[PDB]
Amino acid sequence: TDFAQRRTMMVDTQVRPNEVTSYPVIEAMLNVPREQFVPESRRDVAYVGNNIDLAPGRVLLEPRTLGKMMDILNLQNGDLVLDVGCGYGYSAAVMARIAEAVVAVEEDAAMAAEAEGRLAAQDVFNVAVVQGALAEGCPGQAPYDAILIEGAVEQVPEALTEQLREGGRIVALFREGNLGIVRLGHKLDGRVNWRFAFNAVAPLLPGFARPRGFVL
Amino acid sequence: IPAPEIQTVTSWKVACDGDEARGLGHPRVWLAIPRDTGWVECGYCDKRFVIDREHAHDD
Amino acid sequence: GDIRKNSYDDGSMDALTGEQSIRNFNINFGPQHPAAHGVLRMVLELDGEIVERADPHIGLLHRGTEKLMESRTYLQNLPYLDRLDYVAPMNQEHAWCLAIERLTGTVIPRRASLIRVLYSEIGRILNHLMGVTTGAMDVGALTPPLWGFEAREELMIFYERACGARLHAAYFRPGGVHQDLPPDLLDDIEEWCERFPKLVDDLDTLLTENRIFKQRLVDIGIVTEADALDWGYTGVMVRGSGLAWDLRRSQPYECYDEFDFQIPVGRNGDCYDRYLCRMAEMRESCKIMQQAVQKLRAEPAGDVLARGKLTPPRRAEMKRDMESLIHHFKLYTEGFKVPAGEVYAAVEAPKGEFGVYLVADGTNKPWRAKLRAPGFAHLQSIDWMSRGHMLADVPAIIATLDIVFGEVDR
Amino acid sequence: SDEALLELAEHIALRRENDVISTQVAFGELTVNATLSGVIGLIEFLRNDPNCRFSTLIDITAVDNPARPARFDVVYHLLSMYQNQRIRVKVQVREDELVPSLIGVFPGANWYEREVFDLFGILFSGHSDLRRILTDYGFRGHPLRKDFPTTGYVEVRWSDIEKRVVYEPVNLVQEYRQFDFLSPWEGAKYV
Amino acid sequence: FARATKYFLMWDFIKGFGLGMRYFVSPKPTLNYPHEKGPLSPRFRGEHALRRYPNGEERCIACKLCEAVCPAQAITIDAEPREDGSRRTTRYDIDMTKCIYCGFCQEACPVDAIVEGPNFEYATETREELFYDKQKLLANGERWEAEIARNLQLDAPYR
Amino acid sequence: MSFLLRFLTWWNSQTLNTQVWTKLYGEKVGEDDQGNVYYQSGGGKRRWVIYNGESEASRISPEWHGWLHHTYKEPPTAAPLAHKPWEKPHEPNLTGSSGAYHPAGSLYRAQPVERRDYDAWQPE
Amino acid sequence: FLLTTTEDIINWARNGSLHWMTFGLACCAVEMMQTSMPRYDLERFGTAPRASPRQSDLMIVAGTLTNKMAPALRKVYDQMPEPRYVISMGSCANGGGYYHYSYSVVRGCDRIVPVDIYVPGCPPTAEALLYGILQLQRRIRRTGTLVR
Numbered sequence A: 001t002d003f004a005q006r007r008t009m010m011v012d013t014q015v016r017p018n019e020v021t022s023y024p025v026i027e028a029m030l031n032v033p034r035e036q037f038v039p040e041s042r043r044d045v046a047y048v049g050n051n052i053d054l055a056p057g058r059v060l061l062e063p064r065t066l067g068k069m070m071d072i073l074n075l076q077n078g079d080l081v082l083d084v085g086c087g088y089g090y091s092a093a094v095m096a097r098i099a100e101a102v103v104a105v106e107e108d109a110a111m112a113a114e115a116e117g118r119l120a121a122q123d124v125f126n127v128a129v130v131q132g133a134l135a136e137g138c139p140g141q142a143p144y145d146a147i148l149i150e151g152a153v154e155q156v157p158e159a160l161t162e163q164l165r166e167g168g169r170i171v172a173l174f175r176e177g178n179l180g181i182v183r184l185g186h187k188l189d190g191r192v193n194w195r196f197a198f199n200a201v202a203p204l205l206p207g208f209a210r211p212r213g214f215v216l
Numbered sequence B: 001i002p003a004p005e006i007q008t009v010t011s012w013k014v015a016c017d018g019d020e021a022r023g024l025g026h027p028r029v030w031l032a033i034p035r036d037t038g039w040v041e042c043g044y045c046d047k048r049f050v051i052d053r054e055h056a057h058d059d
Numbered sequence C: 001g002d003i004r005k006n007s008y009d010d011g012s013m014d015a016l017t018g019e020q021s022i023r024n025f026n027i028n029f030g031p032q033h034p035a036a037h038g039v040l041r042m043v044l045e046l047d048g049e050i051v052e053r054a055d056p057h058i059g060l061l062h063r064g065t066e067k068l069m070e071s072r073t074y075l076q077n078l079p080y081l082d083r084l085d086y087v088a089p090m091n092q093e094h095a096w097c098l099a100i101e102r103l104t105g106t107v108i109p110r111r112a113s114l115i116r117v118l119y120s121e122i123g124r125i126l127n128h129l130m131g132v133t134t135g136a137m138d139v140g141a142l143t144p145p146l147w148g149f150e151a152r153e154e155l156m157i158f159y160e161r162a163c164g165a166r167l168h169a170a171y172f173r174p175g176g177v178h179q180d181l182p183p184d185l186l187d188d189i190e191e192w193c194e195r196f197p198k199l200v201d202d203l204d205t206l207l208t209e210n211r212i213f214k215q216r217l218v219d220i221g222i223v224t225e226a227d228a229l230d231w232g233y234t235g236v237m238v239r240g241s242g243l244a245w246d247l248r249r250s251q252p253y254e255c256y257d258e259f260d261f262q263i264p265v266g267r268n269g270d271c272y273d274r275y276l277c278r279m280a281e282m283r284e285s286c287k288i289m290q291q292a293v294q295k296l297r298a299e300p301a302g303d304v305l306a307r308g309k310l311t312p313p314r315r316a317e318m319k320r321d322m323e324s325l326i327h328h329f330k331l332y333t334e335g336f337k338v339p340a341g342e343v344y345a346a347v348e349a350p351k352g353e354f355g356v357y358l359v360a361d362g363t364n365k366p367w368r369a370k371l372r373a374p375g376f377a378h379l380q381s382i383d384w385m386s387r388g389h390m391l392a393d394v395p396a397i398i399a400t401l402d403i404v405f406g407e408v409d410r
Numbered sequence D: 001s002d003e004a005l006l007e008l009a010e011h012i013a014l015r016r017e018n019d020v021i022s023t024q025v026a027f028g029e030l031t032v033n034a035t036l037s038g039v040i041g042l043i044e045f046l047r048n049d050p051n052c053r054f055s056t057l058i059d060i061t062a063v064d065n066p067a068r069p070a071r072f073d074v075v076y077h078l079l080s081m082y083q084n085q086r087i088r089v090k091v092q093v094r095e096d097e098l099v100p101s102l103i104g105v106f107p108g109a110n111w112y113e114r115e116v117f118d119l120f121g122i123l124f125s126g127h128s129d130l131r132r133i134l135t136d137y138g139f140r141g142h143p144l145r146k147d148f149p150t151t152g153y154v155e156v157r158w159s160d161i162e163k164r165v166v167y168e169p170v171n172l173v174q175e176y177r178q179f180d181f182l183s184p185w186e187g188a189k190y191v
Numbered sequence E: 001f002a003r004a005t006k007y008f009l010m011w012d013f014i015k016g017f018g019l020g021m022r023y024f025v026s027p028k029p030t031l032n033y034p035h036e037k038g039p040l041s042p043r044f045r046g047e048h049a050l051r052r053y054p055n056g057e058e059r060c061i062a063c064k065l066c067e068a069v070c071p072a073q074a075i076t077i078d079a080e081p082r083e084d085g086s087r088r089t090t091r092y093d094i095d096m097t098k099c100i101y102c103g104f105c106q107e108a109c110p111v112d113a114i115v116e117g118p119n120f121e122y123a124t125e126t127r128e129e130l131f132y133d134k135q136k137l138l139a140n141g142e143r144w145e146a147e148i149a150r151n152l153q154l155d156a157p158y159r
Numbered sequence F: 001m002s003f004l005l006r007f008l009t010w011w012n013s014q015t016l017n018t019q020v021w022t023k024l025y026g027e028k029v030g031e032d033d034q035g036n037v038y039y040q041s042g043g044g045k046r047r048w049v050i051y052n053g054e055s056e057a058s059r060i061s062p063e064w065h066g067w068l069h070h071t072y073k074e075p076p077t078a079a080p081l082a083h084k085p086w087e088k089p090h091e092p093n094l095t096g097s098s099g100a101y102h103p104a105g106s107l108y109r110a111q112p113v114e115r116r117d118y119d120a121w122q123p124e
Numbered sequence G: 001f002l003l004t005t006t007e008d009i010i011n012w013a014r015n016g017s018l019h020w021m022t023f024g025l026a027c028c029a030v031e032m033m034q035t036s037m038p039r040y041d042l043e044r045f046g047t048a049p050r051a052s053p054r055q056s057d058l059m060i061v062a063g064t065l066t067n068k069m070a071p072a073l074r075k076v077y078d079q080m081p082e083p084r085y086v087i088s089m090g091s092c093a094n095g096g097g098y099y100h101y102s103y104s105v106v107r108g109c110d111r112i113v114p115v116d117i118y119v120p121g122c123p124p125t126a127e128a129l130l131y132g133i134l135q136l137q138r139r140i141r142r143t144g145t146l147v148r
Ligand code: SF4
Pocket: E066, E069, E070, E071, E072, E073, E074, E075, E094, E098, E099, E100, E101, E102, E103, E104, E105, E106
């Protein structure tokens, strides 16, 4: 299959027209092979404008969502980025081409091991895959300049937002029923202040649900 | 509520269609005046028909 | 079929062309753009104003018509057809009626058949007047639309006098046409037909042999027979290339067999040929309108609806006879049931083949109603058609394809 | 044309035995039910075969049948201007099953398959540009499935706070009314 | 050559100029609105109205056929037995921002209670002025009855 | 300032060029009770009205509406319309005024009708 | 007086030179076009089309507004210099119309932009739209100031 043509078409028609202007992001998405970062059974649909299912309750986000998500994080050459829920590592590979280094946190040992193999096979060396619970992050290498959460959340735990540098940026997809809002957060005076960025949908990550009990 | 229209009739069965030419009224219905009360009302236009008992002719 | 890397007759390769193309000249052509019909977002990649990539983004007028149709009866869905290729609404109603009539096995009265031909050709002129004269406006001619839309105004009055609406008639019904035409309306249609060729001459005098008009259309958007088969072309999009295909002749419907008209075809298959074909079709439609009015006058008085179990009775009968009142009550609430089955009914709509794929399941509502718009297939080919041309040619190419987005998006 | 369509159906059933599951001629139209694995080969044969020269792809659509093990039907409508005939091809597709793309045969199949993918959620393999074509960017769901609500789930509004057009959950001032008129009497089929 | 000669002498432009001047001095069909109006046939579908009988009683009997046929679900009706036992509505709303002005309701009405009238100049400054209630619709019928009745007579032979 | 109003405005009963045109080609057909004057040319081929006051198209009553819109051939002077005793006088569009129609629950009403569909128990 | 007569002059100039953006969404745009054609000649009122929002005073929302289109309509409205007026033309723009219960349609363009006049109809006739434009002129005369 000519995956290069499909990759170029994905950027032209799903990323560029969706208010993604950062050329570093466009350059990265034009170069990182998406099909190398999906399960083998999904290889032919790697460039479809939809979320790819990786494991039960986990997806590789749609190209529009990731393109816009990275464009608003506004990553710098000197940035250290935390990528929560890296799946097979596609997003980490894209961000690795912009930021200084990426700490990719994955919770499924099957996907964490595949991420290491696939990241190495693409000669990506500024990405460390750290295995553990998504809601914990990786506080060993904190603070981070930017945090990207690659799946829907209902709340972002304080433990996760404490690993954010002052002036750091966090982008998360929030789920309110059938509505999904991507919000961009800025750490100021120790508090992360969230603002609306755009609307997109993804399944809820395990460990980011909210406490919901009996209400009269 | 008072009736919008009263007609006095000498028959115990009347037809009402809204009195409008060539399909401009309501569906044509036949109404029976009870011998007890001596009047009936159209269910479409509310016109009241009242029997003239002295001249009321049985058919 | 990819010109993004420039190819020069001297074989030169620029240093920048060697680099991967990351910073391209991309421009939003529409939706708010005089040539974009309001709801076309075409993303163009330009290289010195040469169009190297055209990426139409549609759906800016997608309204979910096909979903909305599944919760309505067959009669309640008839007005949805008006609002697809809304320049000529009764022509789209016709496909819906034909599909229902085929599944129910219903025969419509003779007068209703003649009226359908009459107002279908009015719609063809309504469309071709809009297409040709706004196409002229796309290449800078200010005046043609003003002349053409005065004639459209008169035809929209003929619409209103038949059904009470200038645009969205809801006039063709499963089983015929809703109402009969007043005799004075037939006199006025005949009077209009006698004048109309004069306007066609005036538009022809202004445009056809104008050197500027020729330099904006001749050898622009050339379509070969093989291209037509790649992209599902129908209507003038194939006839301009010389294929004498017209559904009114190849797959006759209504009473078109007994009318006299000819099929204009082009020899070069470019924007100029398709303009000439549309002008000629307008003359042919005017002749059909004249024959239909003569046949209607020569007809004996008859009904315009099949009545029976498919259409409501007349109002006078409804107010007198018990059977008629029941049929009125039931057919305006539940409506007729359509036997289980699937049909595809197509007409030669003014913009090409318009069809309805109707899946009935024996109830009073469609199970699935797929609407086949000719403009959907025509617009899809704009990337192939526009590649290699200049930006100034784009509005002419959008015109020649005859796009209305009520039917592209549905 | 009825005898002609039955004769044509035998020709197809004979030459493409393994592709064709069955044929039907109803309401003057020939429908061919085909296997998913052989649909591309069959449509290619229909396009190129002398007797059946179906070189115009009229459209591709889908039909949802939630009561069926393979809930979707994908329907191909083809026209022959040279033979002056039409044909319909139907394949049954399960949810999450991939359908081979027809763009190799008909370049104009590209947008129709995007529409099926958008409105039904059926993915096509071998598609160069498979993305939503009619719904809003980032739309959730596939509206033409019978289990998607008519009004959907979300609606847009301009927010003065965000200075953006944002999505919100649907709130209807008047709820959709779905009248049920259908009579409990089928009627008779007289002989 | 003949075509090349005519282009050198600008004949195509001269013909256009002459045609333009013929239109220049010709009568204009423009209407002098609001003094002069376009033509309306008796069938014209305009603003809705609820009619009364010649005896002054309401024609509507709350059958709800108009509410059932309405393709846009623009009609909402509630009915009870009136104090005299008559079958009459207590609510009759038309959402004029949902209505498609198709005229199906007046076709479905068995008593000519709801009609689309000749009026089309009722643009409003606020949206809620287009949520017509029963009294608004009846007021339209009482003001436009004379023209509505004449139009019904004119189109009766075709209905 | 009467002449200036005629010279500078177009919403006061007629422009100056409408008046000249009416004088040249107008033939009076009748008057309505508001003082609007109706004219025709070519024996009713063209029909127009000169407004007494603001030129508001919704001021034309149903008495003349049919003639002015060519629905009926003959003017109400020659063929008056039959009126029922329960009919009400014509009103123009009242949208920008205090007489505009508003729904019963509108906040314009200043006594919006309170709605409910159940009766609540009241403690003794 | 000075200020009221100043506003009257401003309202006179703004009413007599009301330029509208070339912006039509659906079948309401067909009747809007007829309003500018010879039978009605909207331009004779000084109400002329302008391709660019930077030169437009009036937006006529003529057609269905879908969710996908709503941001684009808001953007070009935001790029109109002030004063800017909006006319909602037809059922779809007024309240959603025939597609009110759809998943992809804005149920009234006043959810996106403020509206000055609503013109009823599906479509309003070319004359009905012309009436609506003159009602906007009455509104400006009644309430127009230097701000709008
Ligand atoms: S005109 Fe049509 S959409 Fe409007 S209320 Fe009547 S039936 Fe409903």
